[PDB]
Amino acid sequence: VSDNELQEMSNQGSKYVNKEIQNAVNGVKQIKTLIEKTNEERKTLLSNLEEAKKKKEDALNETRESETKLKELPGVCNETMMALWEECKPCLKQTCMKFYARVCRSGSGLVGRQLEEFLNQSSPFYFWMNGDRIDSLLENDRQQTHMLDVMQDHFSRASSIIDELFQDRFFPHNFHAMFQPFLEMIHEAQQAMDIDDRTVCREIRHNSTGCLRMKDQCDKCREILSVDCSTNNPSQAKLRRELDESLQVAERLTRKYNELLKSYQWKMLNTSSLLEQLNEQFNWVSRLANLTQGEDQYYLRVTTVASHTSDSDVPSGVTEVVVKLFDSDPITVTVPVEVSRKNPKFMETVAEKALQEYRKKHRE
Ligand SMILES: *[C@@H]1O[C@H](CO)[C@@H](O[C@@H]2O[C@H](CO)[C@@H](O)[C@H](O)[C@H]2NC(C)=O)[C@H](O)[C@H]1NC(C)=O
Ligand SMILES: *[C@@H]1O[C@H](CO)[C@@H](O)[C@H](O)[C@H]1NC(C)=O
Ligand SMILES: *[C@@H]1O[C@H](CO)[C@@H](O)[C@H](O)[C@H]1NC(C)=O
Ligand SMILES: *[C@@H]1O[C@H](CO)[C@@H](O)[C@H](O)[C@H]1NC(C)=O
Ligand SMILES: *[C@@H]1O[C@H](CO)[C@@H](O)[C@H](O)[C@H]1NC(C)=O
Ligand SMILES: *[C@@H]1O[C@H](CO)[C@@H](O)[C@H](O)[C@H]1NC(C)=O
């Protein structure tokens, strides 16, 4: 390669560095809108959760009403209920202790104590009136209300931090004066946002009440559900079915709310990833702004342009171009042989690929 050729190639390749400055600045604005867009997608998702919560809490009132209707229906349960209950508690305890020792593998004794402690402070009427499911829903409702109050407090806080950053009309040699205010705002926003058998064993750890799924295993507990109360009225089996149904509704609406929460979590994660990009982008314009101080328009210098013809170690269809960027280590870039050196795209490729290597490597 001619020496007069290299100096003109380098002089050409340095023009593509001046462009990368404007490109990196635009990339900030490209991220800026992506964040705002993602911020609007969750404001849409928030109003859906406002509505879904209303439908859920209305489905629970109807469940609480279907419950109390069954309670107030006159009539008494046969004393046989207490006889099963004393053979249902030891069966249920032994079952959950076995399951915990088998699958979960931990101290089955502690579980058995807590469960027996709960089974003595409970009545078989609780199981008969499906109180386990009723209380299960109420617990999930709190957590979903809490989990949203948590997400809403991190997001809307960071959202306001970002709504103070994006007010700057940005969206000189003394850029380090803008550098620190912007970069710290991104950090303050970032830290605001950061948060079968395996599952059941976790629920048994959280509360011994998780064992109540295994009531189906015990026969005596299954019998308790089929005892004649309400003096054997047809309204009983009618109200019991009406309760069963009003639960299914409240259970299904609780699921559909979780999927909207899991969606709200994706929005929160997505947005924190767009901040890491905005962070690394501002550290790239900072490095560029530093490295482009002065009246010098040299930034890229082509060292050697080799091929399979010259070096031979070079692969068959690439041309390895060694370059120095911003007065740093020599960088080797593989641009295809299909590209001719006459092509302005040749140095455009060398520059772009070289800027990537310097962006990832050079410590700053
Ligand atoms: C729940 O009640 C049962 C029955 O009263 C308790 O079982 C008794 O436990 C004591 C202490 O181990 C024994 O001396 C008795 O013989 C047991 N009686 C029967 C009928 O099993 C059980 O301990 C209670 N659960 C608690 C307190 O958590
Ligand atoms: C619950 O539903 C019943 C029947 O539809 C209604 O009379 C009652 O006002 C409701 N309560 C609430 C708090 O929504
Ligand atoms: C309880 O069972 C006994 C024996 O089967 C029966 O005579 C009685 O009518 C039952 N009472 C109720 C309320 O079901
Ligand atoms: C466990 O369940 C019982 C009954 O629903 C409840 O009183 C208690 O607060 C629960 N404990 C935890 C840690 O959720
Ligand atoms: C953003 O969320 C969508 C679903 O809403 C998901 O498919 C995608 O992987 C998420 N992206 C990131 C970076 O979390
Ligand atoms: C830019 O230069 C200043 C002054 O030397 C330095 O403190 C700062 O860390 C540099 N920024 C980058 C991104 O290298």
Author numbering: 26 to 196, 212 to 213, 239 to 260, 280 to 448
Task: Quote the study's own text.
Structure-based mutational analysis demonstrated that two disordered, hydrophobic peptide tails enable diverse activities. Resembling the substrate-binding regions of small heat-shock proteins, these sequences mediate clusterin’s chaperone function in suppressing amyloid-β, tau and α-synuclein aggregation.
For crystallization, we designed a single-chain construct (Clu-Δ(214–238)) comprising a deletion of a predicted unstructured sequence including the furin cleavage site. Upon expression in the presence of the α-mannosidase I inhibitor kifunensine to generate uniform oligomannose N-glycans, purified Clu-Δ(214–238) crystallized at acidic pH in two distinct lattice types, crystal forms I and II, diffracting to 2.8-Å and 3.5-Å resolution, respectively. Crystal form I contained one copy of Clu-Δ(214–238) while crystal form II contained two independent copies. aData from two crystals were merged for processing of crystal form II. The three conformations in the crystal lattices differed slightly in their domain orientations, with root-mean-square deviation (r.m.s.d.) values of 1.5–2.0 Å (Cα positions). While the DD seems fairly rigid, its linkers to helices α2 and α10 deviate considerably between crystal forms, indicating structural plasticity. Importantly, the model of the WT structure contains extended unstructured regions, including disordered tails at the C terminus of the β-chain (residues 199–227) and at the N terminus of the α-chain (residues 228–244). These tails are generated by furin cleavage in the unstructured sequence of WT Clu that is deleted in Clu-Δ(214–238).
